[PDB]
Amino acid sequence: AHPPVYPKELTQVFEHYINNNLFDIDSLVKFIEELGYNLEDLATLCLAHLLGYKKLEEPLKREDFLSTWFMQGCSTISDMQECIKTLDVKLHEDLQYFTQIYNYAFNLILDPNRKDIDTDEGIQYWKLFFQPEYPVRMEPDLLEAWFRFLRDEGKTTISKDTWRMLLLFFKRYPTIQKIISDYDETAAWPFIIDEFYECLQDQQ
Numbered sequence: 479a480h481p482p483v484y485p486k487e488l489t490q491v492f493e494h495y496i497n498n499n500l501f502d503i504d505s506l507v508k509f510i511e512e513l514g515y516n517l518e519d520l521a522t523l524c525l526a527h528l529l530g531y532k533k534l535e536e537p538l539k540r541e542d543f544l545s546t547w548f549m550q551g552c553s554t555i556s557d558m559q560e561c562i563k564t565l566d567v568k569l570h571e572d573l574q575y576f577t578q579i580y581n582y583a584f585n586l587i588l589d590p591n592r593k594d595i596d597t598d599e600g601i602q603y604w605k606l607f608f609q610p611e612y613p614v615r616m617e618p619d620l621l622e623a624w625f626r627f628l629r630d631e632g633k634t635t636i637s638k639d640t641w642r643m644l645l646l647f648f649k650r651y652p653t654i655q656k657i658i659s660d661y662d663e664t665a666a667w668p669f670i671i672d673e674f675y676e677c678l679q680d681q682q
């Protein structure tokens with residue numbers, strides 16, 4: 479009798495969280511909580527990315543759960559906890575990884591049958607991503623003005639273009655004054671960012 483491909487300990491974790499025939503969203507939520515996290519955490523994005531999720535609420539195939547953890551040398555909950563802790567450090571320190579996870583976040587949380595995410599959910603993640611502990615340095619007043627602009631101008635969904643480009647925009651112009659002084663409306667930035675620029679101009 480040949481030994482199993484995957485350690486007994488590892489298949490035991492999968493079997494613990496599976497709901498009937500699927501490792502579904504409820505499985506993921508309970509698993510994340512046992513790892514020490516909440517669904518909304520940026521660390522959860524790192525976990526989902528590691529496991530190869532395309533959509534947050536899509537079931538995770540047994541083989542994908544096992545092969546992923548096996549390749550990372552993890553068989554137990556404690557091993558998996560150490561892995562995510564390592565990814566979380568990388569999210570804080572590694573600009574390439576940070577940019578990758580920032581971009582990944584949009585498609586992961588996107589509907590089934592939508593092109594855009596809700597503004598509420600965008601702001602929820604933006605408030606996490608643009609904290610000082612992460613690689614992109616910017617003034618809090620600017621981030622706040624962005625949220626206020628979206629609310630005030632009735633911007634209720636956010637597109638992939640707005641999402642991806644905002645990261646570049648805040649990196650390039652990390653302060654309201656720098657946007658005021660230096661932004662060029664002819665430079666082919668998203669229209670929504672042109673609108674934000676004009677909003678900032680009007681508040682001066």
Ligand SMILES: [Cl-]
Pocket residue numbers: 638639640642643
């Ligand atoms: Cl884009």
Ligand SMILES: [Cl-]
Pocket residue numbers: 643
């Ligand atoms: Cl572009």
Ligand SMILES: [Cl-]
Pocket residue numbers: none
């Ligand atoms: Cl680009």
Ligand SMILES: [Cl-]
Pocket residue numbers: 642643645646
């Ligand atoms: Cl970019």
Ligand SMILES: [Pt+2]
Pocket residue numbers: 642643646
């Ligand atoms: Pt871009």
